[PDB]
Design a protein around this ligand. Structure first.
Ligand SMILES: Brc1ccc(C[NH2+][C@]23C[C@H]4C[C@H](C[C@H](C4)C2)C3)s1
Lengths: 31, 31, 31, 31
């Protein structure tokens, strides 16, 4: 209902960090 | 025509998830 | 000078795709 | 206090490039 800020923008940011957590661990575990 | 929200922002978010789907599968298939 | 849209948002989107091009090729060349 | 632009958007952009720096080096060091 709030057009001030769509959840897509916020979700995109959250996903970015989330991926880093998984990607970061993958690097540590495997090269 | 609508300057309220550019497609670039929306597309960027979609791409993020899209990449995760491919990247996620790659990890499962190969380390 | 234009506060309508910052270049950071546009650049971020461009970078996303750009990375995919390099990342995509890397997968094809190496698993 | 400034609703003109949230730090999440700016941070997201910074993270994108930051990840590339680490990801780019990883590729150079290891395939
Ligand atoms: Br327009 C816009 C607003 C916020 C955006 C963040 N998008 C990305 C897309 C992919 C590259 C980087 C980091 C992750 C994944 C999020 C930027 S793009």
């Amino acid at each position: 209902s709030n057009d001030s800020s769509d959840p897509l923008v916020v979700a995109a940011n959250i996903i970015g960090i989330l991926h880093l957590i998984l990607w970061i661990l993958d690097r540590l575990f495997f090269k």
